[PDB]
């Protein structure tokens, strides 16, 4: 009945940002020392409450969102950010109460022929609302000329591949990001510390 963080952090394969994975965690005891007393992580910035004190707090649900981005774009995973990833793929709200954990995964997610299994959205008619997921592949209309499902000039496929290669610079290398969201809503606390 311990909370299955291993399934999220230790997954063989991660989601793409535009189709970011969300794991609901409920009805269990969460040992937060496993994640936070670790030397793995390259980025560990909480915004709501401090991770040390995590064990003394208690929540309705916790949401573990997971995805892969470039190192350069880990900065965009934070409240009030803007950019391709924050606006079109994964947006956190300004009242975010959680933790952003990121780590370098060049050894896992880069291949010499290019790793095209991780995509992102580069075009969208409006900015995402916080925690919106857009999985549409509708051709993006970039001009006044309409796209009736056909790609051409000013009509672009909305998704792009990272093509992660091992030779890339650290800023261009893949990073696995898990974002922990602690909501304490109108319902009882169903996840808590030891």
């Amino acid at each position: 009945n311990l909370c299955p963080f291993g399934e999220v952090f230790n997954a063989t394969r991660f989601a793409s940002v535009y189709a970011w994975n969300r794991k609901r965690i409920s009805n269990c005891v969460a040992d937060y020392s496993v994640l936070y007393n670790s030397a793995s992580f390259s980025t560990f910035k909480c915004y709501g409450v401090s991770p040390t004190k995590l064990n003394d707090l208690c929540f309705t649900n916790v949401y573990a969102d997971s995805f892969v981005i470039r190192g350069d774009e880990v900065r965009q995973i934070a409240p009030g950010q803007t950019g391709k990833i924050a606006d079109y793929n994964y947006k956190l709200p300004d009242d975010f109460t959680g933790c952003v954990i990121a780590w370098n995964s060049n050894n896992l997610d880069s291949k010499v022929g290019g790793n095209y299994n991780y995509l992102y959205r580069l075009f969208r008619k409006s900015n995402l609302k916080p925690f919106e997921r857009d999985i549409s592949t509708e051709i993006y209309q970039a001009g006044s000329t309409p796209c009736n499902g056909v790609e051409g000039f000013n009509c672009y496929f909305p998704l792009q591949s990272y093509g992660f290669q091992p030779t890339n610079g650290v800023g261009y290398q893949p990073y696995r990001v898990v974002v922990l969201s602690f909501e304490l809503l109108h319902a009882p606390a169903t996840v808590c510390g030891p």
Partner: antibody
Amino acid sequence: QVQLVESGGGLVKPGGSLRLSCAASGFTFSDYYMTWIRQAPGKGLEWVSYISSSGSTIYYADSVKGRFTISRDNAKNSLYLQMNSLRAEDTAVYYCARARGSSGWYRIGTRWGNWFDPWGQGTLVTVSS
Amino acid sequence: ALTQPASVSGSPGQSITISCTGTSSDVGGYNYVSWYQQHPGKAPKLMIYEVSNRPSGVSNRFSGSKSGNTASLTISGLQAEDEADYYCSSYTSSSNVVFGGGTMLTVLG
């Protein structure tokens, strides 16, 4: 180190069935789209079919549709082509090839899985009475 | 299904181009045109992908271009070892790949 070896070719009579296999080494088989491409003696390349990582995204050429079944075993690192109702026009070298880029986890990955490297040596299939 | 010239020939050292014509639904619709060279008794070798990308190791004499519904493979400074069959392929609107009929390139002299 990366290696693609296909077997199971030979003689088959018109209307018979034959099963080709391709064994892979040196890369994580589970991550890529896999193809069969064929070439008749003295003739050009003809793309046959390709399969995604799970096996749930499959595309066939019109010449081959309704007769061939592509399939994959990730635990055994093997690709298979089941050919049925063979005719003489199916006589060809059947090459097994891997998409140079890994894009197998998505149905959308056909976009980034359409240029092929490495290839195997090929297997000769003769449809004759 | 993609249209290639059956054969072309150039003199050594010259520049030579091989055209591959498709339709709106393939070469004209996407930037996923690949080129392969094939020598006698060998498997095809990828020279160009995504219209113009060259894999690492392929000679810089090979380059790829696209315009309209016609892709082109161009070889600068022909050499006798470039004499082979050349095939273009592209991704289709039905998520297939189709190849052209192939082109036997002859080096004169």
